[PDB]
Design a protein around this ligand. Structure first.
Ligand SMILES: [K+]
Ligand SMILES: [K+]
Ligand SMILES: [K+]
Ligand SMILES: [K+]
Ligand SMILES: [K+]
Ligand SMILES: [K+]
Ligand SMILES: [K+]
Ligand SMILES: [K+]
Ligand SMILES: [K+]
Ligand SMILES: [K+]
Ligand SMILES: [K+]
Ligand SMILES: [K+]
Ligand SMILES: [K+]
Ligand SMILES: [K+]
Ligand SMILES: [K+]
Ligand SMILES: [K+]
Ligand SMILES: [K+]
Ligand SMILES: [K+]
Ligand SMILES: [K+]
Ligand SMILES: [K+]
Ligand SMILES: [K+]
Ligand SMILES: [K+]
Ligand SMILES: [K+]
Ligand SMILES: [K+]
Ligand SMILES: [K+]
Ligand SMILES: [K+]
Ligand SMILES: [K+]
Ligand SMILES: [K+]
Ligand SMILES: [K+]
Ligand SMILES: [Mg+2]
Ligand SMILES: [Mg+2]
Ligand SMILES: [Mg+2]
Ligand SMILES: [Mg+2]
Ligand SMILES: [Mg+2]
Ligand SMILES: [Mg+2]
Ligand SMILES: [Mg+2]
Ligand SMILES: [Mg+2]
Ligand SMILES: [Mg+2]
Ligand SMILES: [Mg+2]
Ligand SMILES: [Mg+2]
Ligand SMILES: [Mg+2]
Ligand SMILES: [Mg+2]
Ligand SMILES: [Mg+2]
Ligand SMILES: [Mg+2]
Ligand SMILES: [Mg+2]
Ligand SMILES: [Mg+2]
Ligand SMILES: [Mg+2]
Ligand SMILES: [Mg+2]
Ligand SMILES: [Mg+2]
Ligand SMILES: [Mg+2]
Ligand SMILES: [Mg+2]
Ligand SMILES: [Mg+2]
Ligand SMILES: [Mg+2]
Ligand SMILES: [Mg+2]
Ligand SMILES: [Mg+2]
Ligand SMILES: [Mg+2]
Ligand SMILES: [Mg+2]
Ligand SMILES: [Mg+2]
Ligand SMILES: [Mg+2]
Ligand SMILES: [Mg+2]
Ligand SMILES: [Mg+2]
Ligand SMILES: [Mg+2]
Ligand SMILES: [Mg+2]
Ligand SMILES: [Mg+2]
Lengths: 91, 59, 101
RNA sequence: GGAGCUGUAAGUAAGCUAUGAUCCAGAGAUUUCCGAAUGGGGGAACCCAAUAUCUUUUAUAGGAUAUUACUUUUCAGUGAAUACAUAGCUGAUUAGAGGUAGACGCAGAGAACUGAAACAUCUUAGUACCUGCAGGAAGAGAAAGAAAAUUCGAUUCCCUGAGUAGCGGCGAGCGAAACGGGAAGAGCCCAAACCAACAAGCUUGUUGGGGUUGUAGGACUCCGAUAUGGUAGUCUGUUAGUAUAGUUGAAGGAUUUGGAAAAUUCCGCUAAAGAGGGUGAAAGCCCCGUAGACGAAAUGCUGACAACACCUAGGAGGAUCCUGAGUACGGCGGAACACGAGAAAUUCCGUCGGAAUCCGCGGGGACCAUCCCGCAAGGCUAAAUACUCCCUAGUGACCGAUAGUGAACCAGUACCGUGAGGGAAAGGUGAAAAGCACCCCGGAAGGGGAGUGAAAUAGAUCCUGAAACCGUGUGCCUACAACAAGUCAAAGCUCGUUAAUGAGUGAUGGCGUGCCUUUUGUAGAAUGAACCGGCGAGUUACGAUUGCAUGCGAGGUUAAGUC
RNA sequence: GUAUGAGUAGCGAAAGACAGGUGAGAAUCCUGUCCACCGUAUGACUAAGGUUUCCUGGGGAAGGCUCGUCCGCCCAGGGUUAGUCGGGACCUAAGCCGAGGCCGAUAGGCGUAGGCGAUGGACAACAGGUUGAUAUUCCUGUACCAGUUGUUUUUGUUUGA
RNA sequence: CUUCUAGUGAGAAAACAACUGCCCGUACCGUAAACCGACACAGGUAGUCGAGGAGAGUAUCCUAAGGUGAGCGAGCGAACU
């Protein structure tokens, strides 16, 4: 896949903001992307240096509106920690 | 638009596709935040990329 | 639809029979149309639409297209519409006069 | 095609559109992963690789692309036991796998309940199921035939023959065919003899020619013609038509009721259009349409024309040669023929034996003779015929929400089950949301006003709104009575109708053991019903027979089929 | 669909009391105190299974055999971080699949090579801290395992490490 | 994994510094109200830890760490079970 397609969007939540304070940023990524690919994509996109990438799979969550019930799409969350002496990602 | 694309050259087309892909990336980030206003721009950019790829394949 | 947005039409059936107005909006899928000052309804709105009174608003509701007839602009009378190609352009014509549109 | 559009699906939000959007049809691009699934693995939609190129990093790790299953065909190279070889192995090449449409076809394999009033032969039935192979159809098909009117001339299917001839524990049942009438029609190729070439080992294989049959044909030998016709061929064009979007398409206004007119009433108008649908109630003339006219860039389909292609010779002779072999046929054992071994032909399977070949061979229901008809053991062949998952356009003395598909509604869903599998319920506000602003009680729910509306006792559990069931009000009666609960007689009280010698209630008195089923006999202590509503049982097809009716009458009548 | 039985059976092993708070409303929700119960468990971990039931903020229609301001319920957001843990890129058992192959009316049955297959073998990290919800995964400290690049140091370059 | 040679071989080893290390699971319940039993069901559910006194003991009684007061109650204190 294209490096630009690897990273989908940032994740903004209380936990992710606390992580930012430690200079690690959470991104939703393509479910087929391995953390090595995620590292390459982040570097190319933001010019920062990545120290480590911790990836996890978010299961599809059951939801229902009215008579209809289904599941939210599965997601893949990656927490990317930048090195020291590195630019921050600005969102 | 399709007329402009057909005028372009192959290398120009590829570079334009890369620029459009980067623009789409930024749009995704802005939408994830509250920083995007013209939401229809996302679909516009996607269609532009599709047109370039279609023209490329038809060369 | 044989009627178009912005046309002057005459209401031929309904409580507002013989009224005339301009077509404010057209709904081809429903085959309906809105005519200004025609078929006005009182609607009990909550103040949730940037109206800090809610109030009872007056608005024209659509009526079926077949209950109106286009006003012959040159003569001012309602007429049926034929289709004649003029100067290579397909246009509407007043069957009563031959006037265009 | 020409003004809106961003589905359902409202609501925002942001946009597109006369530079022609949305939308409609033709063609094309993309088309993740699983799935025959095929690089390997696997608990489907996941995991792990090899090779080569490319890509990220200083570099490893990482990413992308292409190829990589198995078997079959052909080719090439490699290459054992083993010398040559062959086998194996490698590569290239070739075409298969799987799914369907719960239909139709052919074939292999193949039941039982049931019927016979038991049951084994027989029947159900070569049916259901399973499996293989298919094609748009299949199968059959060009006589070793049907016949014996003297003749017919491939096959298939329909009518008829006929419930006949027959088969059958001669039971139950099963049950033809030919002739005749129609639908449709079409006939052709090899093997062999012999010839030429090729190659090896005078024949013997390959190639091409040759030749194709029963009034016997062919080879072969003589002659004469190098034409005449045909085809069931071709992504060959050219052309027409057609399918897949479309354009056009006549004619009404008033009056009364109404919330609304298409209804009513008065005068008109149109009709190659008075099919149909919609529109505030029932419209020929308001809308979509219809009759009719017109229309295709693109892609299929059909038909023609042409082209290319492929078939297409007459006569006379027989001296000799050829005309389908482990075949036909026979014994044994099964099976198919309506025919169940029977007197049993004919067809087929397994096993064994096993011919003739033109003076020949097969058949005409054992068998033989005569006569007649035909020429097997090789192949192909359109049409009439069967079926409809689908697509288009319609139809219905077909259903109308317990009906009609299980499914009118997000249904093969929910739900049930380990699984195969089983499998629901559930439609309707109003013309238009105009879906009740505001106020009041209440935490809300829910109400009462106020509004919308023709109507709100149409308020979303929304059309109508039955019965069971539940409750409020009360005109009459009821606390000394033994009651299948009624009916007959009747005072009193209350009320006044489809105005009738009226209605409700009813003290009191006479008589009086429900309904159904099944029984000799049931109030029955025999059976069934908790109540209410809906649904729920002699039908249709083809034959037989009788009555009645009609037409014709010693006559009556057509069936298939054609329009 | 609705009755009758009938406002009847039942409300599913056991201790709760009171004060205060919340709130329209409290035996039932929160807080506190005392009391009581389990304690080879009714405690603490884990595998399977379940599959969001976890956390935070709301709600009280329905579900909860009462009540409910509360819940494993409803509504809206949020939460699962690994070179070292368990599994895969390691190994094999039973069993299963099975190129060719054998057998067989069809379908298929069997099976060699080769594979798959843990419940077993092999295999490098621990302590503390941190959140409302994760931790041998994050953070702090201190390690180890496999490998790449580079600097340096030694030693071998075909009688060859 | 350890050895052996066969083969392969121009590079090897050490220290140091910097650097690389993929996919899947990780929430929560788990002698249970979250699993199997149609139920928030006196049943069933593999493995580990499982303290003190008396005690052989994981028995038994009462307790620690820790967990819990069982999702209808208030009266009355008849028959009968
Ligand atoms: K597979
Ligand atoms: K079918
Ligand atoms: K039988
Ligand atoms: K019987
Ligand atoms: K055929
Ligand atoms: K018959
Ligand atoms: K019998
Ligand atoms: K010939
Ligand atoms: K109308
Ligand atoms: K009409
Ligand atoms: K055409
Ligand atoms: K026979
Ligand atoms: K015969
Ligand atoms: K014959
Ligand atoms: K009504
Ligand atoms: K009453
Ligand atoms: K009486
Ligand atoms: K009885
Ligand atoms: K009941
Ligand atoms: K009751
Ligand atoms: K709460
Ligand atoms: K691991
Ligand atoms: K294990
Ligand atoms: K965890
Ligand atoms: K002790
Ligand atoms: K103890
Ligand atoms: K309780
Ligand atoms: K008592
Ligand atoms: K007692
Ligand atoms: Mg992980
Ligand atoms: Mg266009
Ligand atoms: Mg595969
Ligand atoms: Mg019988
Ligand atoms: Mg086909
Ligand atoms: Mg018209
Ligand atoms: Mg009229
Ligand atoms: Mg027979
Ligand atoms: Mg025989
Ligand atoms: Mg014979
Ligand atoms: Mg003859
Ligand atoms: Mg045919
Ligand atoms: Mg139904
Ligand atoms: Mg109904
Ligand atoms: Mg049904
Ligand atoms: Mg009413
Ligand atoms: Mg109603
Ligand atoms: Mg007395
Ligand atoms: Mg009395
Ligand atoms: Mg009796
Ligand atoms: Mg009964
Ligand atoms: Mg009782
Ligand atoms: Mg209890
Ligand atoms: Mg104990
Ligand atoms: Mg909770
Ligand atoms: Mg909560
Ligand atoms: Mg309750
Ligand atoms: Mg392991
Ligand atoms: Mg096997
Ligand atoms: Mg095989
Ligand atoms: Mg380990
Ligand atoms: Mg936790
Ligand atoms: Mg945990
Ligand atoms: Mg329990
Ligand atoms: Mg105790």
């Amino acid at each position: 896949m294209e490096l630009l397609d690897v990273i989908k969007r940032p994740v903004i939540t209380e936990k992710s903001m606390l992580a930012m304070d430690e200079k690690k940023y959470t991104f939703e990524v393509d479910t087929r992307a391995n953390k090595t690919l995620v590292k390459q994509a982040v570097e190319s996109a933001f010019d920062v240096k990545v120290a480590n990438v911790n990836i996890l799979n978010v299961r599809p969550k059951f939801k229902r509106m009215g008579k209809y019930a289904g599941y939210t799409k599965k997601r893949r969350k990656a927490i990317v920690t930048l090195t020291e002496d590195s630019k921050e990602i600005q969102l | 638009k399709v007329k402009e694309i057909r005028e372009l050259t192959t290398a120009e087309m590829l570079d334009k596709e890369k620029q459009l892909k980067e623009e789409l990336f930024n749009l995704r980030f802005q939408l994830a935040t509250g920083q995007l206003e013209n939401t229809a721009r996302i679909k516009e950019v996607r269609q532009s990329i599709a047109r370039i790829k279609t023209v490329l394949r038809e060369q | 639809m044989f009627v178009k947005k912005g046309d002057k039409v005459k209401v031929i059936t309904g409580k507002d029979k013989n009224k005339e107005g301009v077509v404010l909006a057209a709904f081809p899928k429903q085959d309906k149309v809105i005519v200004e000052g025609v078929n006005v309804v009182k609607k009990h709105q909550k103040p949730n639409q940037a109206a800090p009174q809610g109030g009872i608003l007056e608005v024209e509701a659509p009526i079926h297209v077949s209950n109106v007839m286009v006003i012959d602009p040159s003569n001012g009378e309602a007429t049926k519409v034929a289709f004649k190609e003029v100067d290579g352009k397909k246009v509407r014509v007043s069957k009563k006069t031959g006037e265009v549109l």
